[PDB]
Amino acid sequence: ADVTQTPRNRITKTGKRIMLECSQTKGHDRMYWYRQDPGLGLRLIYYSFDVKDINKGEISDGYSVSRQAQAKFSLSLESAIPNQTALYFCATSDESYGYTFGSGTRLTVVEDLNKVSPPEVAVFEPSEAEISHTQKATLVCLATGFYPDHVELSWWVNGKEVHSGVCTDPQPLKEQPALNDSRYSLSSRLRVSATFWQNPRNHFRCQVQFYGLSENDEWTQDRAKPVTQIVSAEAWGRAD
């Protein structure tokens, strides 16, 4: 990669200073930090044409930047607030608008880390009536009770990730929509032929990667510390 960003994922409490770093290898003069939000596209925060040349974009409030080197452009959330939850992209450009984007930083700002919670994950097996009617078999995975909304769901058949036959909801829903810190739920479907579901040798697993607390974070509750982790549920094929 010419352009690299760190971190890739981060969760933070409100009121903390958070630093995102962009590095490049081609030494282009021009570097940029953007944020992406649903319905708003990519909005420019700050940009730089050389070391100590800094220019505001459309949404610079609450951020600062430093151009430490030809190769490096740093973005800071000065005192993180929840509306700074976004996907952040750095970019470089040559002198002819040839942009190169970094692969992004997914950042979530939460008010209270005590509300962080990994998902519970369950797999629901195919209906006999579907199998009889269509000769296909839909498995459903349901991930519930998680916070914040910062997960990745995947399906694994006999140990290998599958994309075919899968549909996962594009966003989780709120379990308690009247609450600012509601937990979330997410569903996904994996559909296979009935013959493939009917083979008791076949193993089906729904995997949810959850991003939460780090080892560094304090935890004062009796319940499990809600660290970044994987939660899965599984089912074996079965005959009728």
């Binding site: 942009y99 209906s127 036959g165």
Partner: protein, 202 residues
């Protein structure tokens, strides 16, 4: 002074039909113009750009766009909509001789051609010991859409399209569930207009 406008945050096209995603700009002098595509949890990929050379510009996978100064437009087109075209598309423009500014984006939804619909509501059981299940509304065509729940203890997802490559077969579905004793799959989708011939097994 300079902006770029995409209208519609979400648009549909029939599988197989002409793709058309509209973009207009407000610059007095013609700008450079860019179309980017983004897949889920992936970054931005350039499809094509107008850089004051040819006005008919060609991109990857059969995309093209014509720069039309008199209507300040740069609409992206592709001759046939494929299920893999499902993505978010951003039009963007040069500004102030120093940056690219992005439009707000349009997500393209491809409506699968469902020749033999078979609408049904199924009950599915938890693989582990369970008083626990979900309801799956599946195999309806393009004319059905799913409504949000009316009961705050019943959860219903948006419809989702799956493409089973093994059988070259696409289908729509939505999932409903609840932690309630009186929740039956026969009533789960009562706030949706469902096909008169929906299958309800017992």
């Amino acid at each position: 002074a300079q902006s770029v406008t995409q209208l519609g945050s979400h648009v549909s096209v029939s599988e197989g039909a002409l793709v058309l995603l509209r973009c207009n700009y407000s610059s007095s002098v013609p700008p450079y113009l860019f179309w980017y595509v983004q897949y889920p949890n992936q970054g931005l990929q350039l499809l094509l750009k107008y850089t004051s050379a040819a006005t008919l510009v060609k991109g990857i996978n059969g995309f093209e766009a014509e720069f039309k100064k008199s209507e300040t437009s740069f609409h992206l087109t592709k001759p046939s909509a494929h299920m893999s075209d499902a993505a978010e598309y951003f039009c963007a423009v040069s500004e102030q001789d120093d940056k690219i500014i992005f439009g707000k984006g349009t997500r393209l939804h491809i409506l699968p051609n469902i020749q033999n619909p078979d609408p049904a509501v199924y009950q599915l059981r938890d693989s582990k010991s369970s008083d626990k299940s979900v309801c799956l509304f599946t195999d309806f065509d393009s004319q059905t859409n799913v409504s949000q729940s009316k009961d705050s203890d019943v959860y219903i997802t948006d419809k989702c399209v799956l493409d089973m490559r093994s059988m070259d077969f696409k289908s729509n579905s939505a999932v409903a569930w609840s932690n309630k004793s009186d929740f039956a799959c026969a009533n789960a989708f009562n706030n949706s207009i469902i096909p008169e011939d929906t299958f309800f097994p017992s």
